Amino acid sequence: INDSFTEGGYISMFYQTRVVVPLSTPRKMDILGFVSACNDFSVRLLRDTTHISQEA
Amino acid sequence: RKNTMDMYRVELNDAAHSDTPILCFSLSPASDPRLAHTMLGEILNYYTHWAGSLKFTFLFCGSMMATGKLLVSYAPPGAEAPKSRKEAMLGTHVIWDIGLQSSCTMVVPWISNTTYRLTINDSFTEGGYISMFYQTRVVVPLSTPRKMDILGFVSACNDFSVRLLRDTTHISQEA
Amino acid sequence: VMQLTLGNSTITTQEAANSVVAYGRWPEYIKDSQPTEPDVAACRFYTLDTVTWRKESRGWWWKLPDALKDMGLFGQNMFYHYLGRAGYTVHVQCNASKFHQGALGVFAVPEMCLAGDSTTHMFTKYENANPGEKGGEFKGSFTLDTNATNPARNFCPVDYLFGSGVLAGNAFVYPHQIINLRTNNCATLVLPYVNSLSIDSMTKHNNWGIAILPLAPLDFATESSTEIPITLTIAPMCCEFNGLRNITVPRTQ
Amino acid sequence: VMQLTLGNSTITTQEAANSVVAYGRWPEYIKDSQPTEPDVAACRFYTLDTVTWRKESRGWWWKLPDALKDMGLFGQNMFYHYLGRAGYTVHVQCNASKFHQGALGVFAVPEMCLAGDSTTHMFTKYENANPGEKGGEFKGSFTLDTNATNPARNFCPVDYLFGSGVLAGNAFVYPHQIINLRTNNCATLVLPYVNSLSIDSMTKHNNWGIAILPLAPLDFATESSTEIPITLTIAPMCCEFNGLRNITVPRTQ
Amino acid sequence: VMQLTLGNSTITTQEAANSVVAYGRWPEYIKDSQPTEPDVAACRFYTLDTVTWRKESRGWWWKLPDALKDMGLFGQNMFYHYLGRAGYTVHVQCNASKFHQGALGVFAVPEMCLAGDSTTHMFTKYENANPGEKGGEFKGSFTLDTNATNPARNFCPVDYLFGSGVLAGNAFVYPHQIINLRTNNCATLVLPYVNSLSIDSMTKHNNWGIAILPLAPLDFATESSTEIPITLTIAPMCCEFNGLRNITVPRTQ
Amino acid sequence: KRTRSESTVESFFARGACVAIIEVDNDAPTKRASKLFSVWKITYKDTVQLRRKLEFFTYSRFDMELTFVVTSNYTDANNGHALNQVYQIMFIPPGAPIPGKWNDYTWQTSSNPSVFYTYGAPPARISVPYVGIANAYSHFYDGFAKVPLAGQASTEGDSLYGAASLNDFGSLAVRVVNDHNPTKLTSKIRVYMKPKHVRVWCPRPPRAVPYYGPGVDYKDGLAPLPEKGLTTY
Amino acid sequence: KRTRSESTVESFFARGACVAIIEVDNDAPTKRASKLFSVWKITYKDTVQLRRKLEFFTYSRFDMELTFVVTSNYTDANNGHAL
Amino acid sequence: NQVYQIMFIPPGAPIPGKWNDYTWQTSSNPSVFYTYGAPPARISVPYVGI
Ligand SMILES: CCCCCCCCCCCCC/C=C/[C@H](O)[C@H](N)CO
Ligand SMILES: CCCCCCCCCCCCC/C=C/[C@H](O)[C@H](N)CO
DSSP H or E run through D163:
none
DSSP H or E run through B155:
strand B147-156
DSSP per-residue codes, F53-116: HHTTEEEEEEEEEEEEEEEEEES-SSS--PPPPEEEEEEE-TTSPPP-STTSGGGG-SSS-EEE
DSSP H or E run through C176:
strand C176-180
Contact E48, E135 (CB under 8 A): yes
Return the half-sphere exposure (C-beta side, CA atoms, 13 A cut-off) of residue F228. 6
Collect all residues of chain E within an 8 Å Cβ-Cβ radius of residue B122: none
Residue F180, Cβ neighbours under 10 Å: how many? 19
CA distances from G16 to C79, D89, E241, F109, G68 (A): 45, 60, 46, 7, 11
Contact F94, B124 (CB under 8 A): no
Contact C227, C66 (CB under 8 A): no
- Please tell me the distance between residue F139's alpha carbon and the centre of ligand 1 in angstroms: 13
Task: Answer positive or negative: Cα dihedral of B18, B22, B28, B31.
Answer: positive
DSSP per-residue codes, F5-64: SSSSHHHHH-S-EEEEEEEEEES-TT-TTS-SEEEEE--STTSSHHHHHHTTEEEEEEEE
Contact C229, C95 (CB under 8 A): yes
Kindly report the backbone phi and psi dihedral angles of residue E24, in degrees, each rounded to the nearest multiple of 5, phi listed first.
Answer: 75, 15
For residues B66 and B60, give the distance between their C-alpha atoms in angstroms, rounded to a whole number: 10
Alpha helices by DSSP H, listed for chain B, are 33-36, 39-45, 85-88
Return the half-sphere exposure (C-beta side, CA atoms, 13 A cut-off) of residue A22. 3
Kindly report the backbone phi and psi dihedral angles of residue D128, in degrees, each rounded to the nearest multiple of 5, phi listed first.
Answer: -95, -25
Contact B62, C182 (CB under 8 A): yes
First-to-last alpha carbon distance for chain B, in angstroms, is 33
For residues F159 and D104, give the distance between their C-alpha atoms in angstroms, rounded to a whole number: 53
Kindly report the backbone phi and psi dihedral angles of residue E174, in degrees, each rounded to the nearest multiple of 5, phi listed first.
Answer: -70, 160
DSSP H or E run through C135:
none
First-to-last alpha carbon distance for chain H, in angstroms, is 40
**Mode of pairing for the β-strands spanning B92-98 and D9-13:** parallel
Whether residue A42 lies within 8 A of chain H, CB to CB, comes out as no
Non-local (6+) Cβ contacts of B7 within 8 A are B1, C160
Among residues C2, C7, C9, C4, the alpha carbon closest in space to that of C238 is found at: C7
Characterise D203 by phi-psi region: left (phi > 0), alpha (psi -120 to 50), beta (else).
alpha
First-to-last alpha carbon distance for chain C, in angstroms, is 43
Contact B164, B46 (CB under 8 A): no
Q: What is the CA radius of gyration of chain E?
A: 19
For residues D90 and D63, give the distance between their C-alpha atoms in angstroms, rounded to a whole number: 12
3-state secondary structure of C41: helix
Atom 5 of ligand 1: nearest residue by CA position = F91
Among residues D102, D101, D100, D104, the alpha carbon closest in space to that of D59 is found at: D104
Whether residue D228 lies within 8 A of chain B, CB to CB, comes out as yes
Beta strands in chain E (DSSP E): 2-6, 9-13, 20-21, 46-47, 51-53, 60-64, 81-94, 100-110, 136-137, 176-180, 186-191, 200-201, 208-220, 228-244
- Please tell me the distance between residue F63's alpha carbon and the centre of ligand 2 in angstroms: 32
Atom 19 of ligand 1: nearest residue by CA position = F137
3-state secondary structure of E129: helix
In a mutational test of the E interface, the residue from A23, A24, A25, A52 whose CB has the highest number of chain E CBs within 10 Å is A25
Kindly report the backbone phi and psi dihedral angles of residue D92, in degrees, each rounded to the nearest multiple of 5, phi listed first.
Answer: -110, 125
Residue A5, Cβ neighbours under 10 Å: how many? 6
Among residues B27, B12, B157, the alpha carbon closest in space to that of B96 is found at: B12
Q: What single-letter amino acid sits at D180?
A: N
Among residues D253, D193, D186, D153, the alpha carbon closest in space to that of D65 is found at: D193
Contact C226, C220 (CB under 8 A): yes
For residues H31 and H26, give the distance between their C-alpha atoms in angstroms, rounded to a whole number: 7
Characterise H26 by phi-psi region: left (phi > 0), alpha (psi -120 to 50), beta (else).
left
Contact E125, E152 (CB under 8 A): no
Note if the bond before D65 is cis, omega within 30 degrees.
yes
Collect all residues of chain B within an 8 Å Cβ-Cβ radius of residue E83: 76, 78, 111-113
For residues C54 and C62, give the distance between their C-alpha atoms in angstroms, rounded to a whole number: 18
Non-local (6+) Cβ contacts of E95 within 8 A are E185, E228, E229
Return the half-sphere exposure (C-beta side, CA atoms, 13 A cut-off) of residue D52. 10
Note if the bond before D27 is cis, omega within 30 degrees.
no
Contact E153, E146 (CB under 8 A): no
Return the half-sphere exposure (C-beta side, CA atoms, 13 A cut-off) of residue C231. 11
Contact C64, C130 (CB under 8 A): no
**Minimal CA separation from A19 to chain F, in Å:** 19
Contact D108, D174 (CB under 8 A): yes
**Minimal CA separation from C102 to chain B, in Å:** 6
> Which protein residues are within 6 Å of ligand 1, measured from CB?
F 42, 44, 64, 66, 89-91, 113-115, 126, 128, 131, 137-139, 166-167, 169-170, 172
Tell me, using a 6 A CB cutoff, whether residue H32 lines ligand 2. Answer: yes
Residue F101, Cβ neighbours under 10 Å: how many? 13
C143 DSSP β-pair partners: none
**Mode of pairing for the β-strands spanning D20-21 and D186-191:** parallel
In chain H, what is the greatest distance between 2 CA atoms, to the nearest angstrom? 40
Sheet holding C176-180, edge to edge: C136-137, C60-64, C208-220, C100-110, C176-180
Ligand nearest the Cα of residue H26 is 2
D213 DSSP β-pair partners: D105
Contact C59, C230 (CB under 8 A): no
Return the half-sphere exposure (C-beta side, CA atoms, 13 A cut-off) of residue F18. 23
CA distances from F148 to A28, B82, C43 (A): 50, 16, 68
Torsion angle, alpha carbons of F160, F164, F170, F174, to 10: -30
First-to-last alpha carbon distance for chain G, in angstroms, is 56
DSSP per-residue codes, F146-186: S--BTT--TTSS---BS--STT---EEEEEE-SPPPSS-EE
For residues D113 and D211, give the distance between their C-alpha atoms in angstroms, rounded to a whole number: 12
Among residues H38, F166, C15, the alpha carbon closest in space to that of B64 is found at: C15
Non-local (6+) Cβ contacts of D187 within 8 A are D16, D17, D19, D91, D92, D104, D106, D177, D178, D179
Sheet holding B161-165, edge to edge: B117-118, B47-51, B161-165
Breaks in chain E, named by the residue before each, with C–N above 2.5 Å?
33
What approach was used to elucidate this structure? cryo-EM
Beta strands in C30-162 (DSSP E): 46-47, 51-53, 60-64, 81-94, 100-110, 136-137
F191 DSSP β-pair partners: F20, F68
Burial of F80 (0-12, 13-18, 19+ CB in 10 A): middle
Q: What single-letter amino acid sits at A18?
A: R
For residues C69 and C78, give the distance between their C-alpha atoms in angstroms, rounded to a whole number: 7
Beta strands in B14-128 (DSSP E): 23-26, 47-51, 54-60, 67-75, 92-98, 103-108, 117-118
Contact D179, D106 (CB under 8 A): yes
Chain F neighbours (≥3 Cβ pairs under 8 A) are: A, B, E, G, H
- Please tell me the distance between residue H4's alpha carbon and the centre of ligand 2 in angstroms: 21
Non-local (6+) Cβ contacts of E1 within 8 A are E13, E14, E16
Atom 19 of ligand 2: nearest residue by CA position = H49
Residue E160, Cβ neighbours under 10 Å: how many? 18
Q: Return contacts of F225-232, CB within 8 angstroms, 24+ apart.
A: F225/E167
Atom 4 of ligand 1: nearest residue by CA position = F91
Burial of F97 (0-12, 13-18, 19+ CB in 10 A): buried
First-to-last alpha carbon distance for chain A, in angstroms, is 26
For residues D65 and D50, give the distance between their C-alpha atoms in angstroms, rounded to a whole number: 18
For residues B53 and B110, give the distance between their C-alpha atoms in angstroms, rounded to a whole number: 5
Contact F72, H1 (CB under 8 A): yes
Burial of F201 (0-12, 13-18, 19+ CB in 10 A): middle
Task: Answer positive or negative: Cα dihedral of G20, G26, G27, G29.
Answer: positive
Burial of E253 (0-12, 13-18, 19+ CB in 10 A): exposed
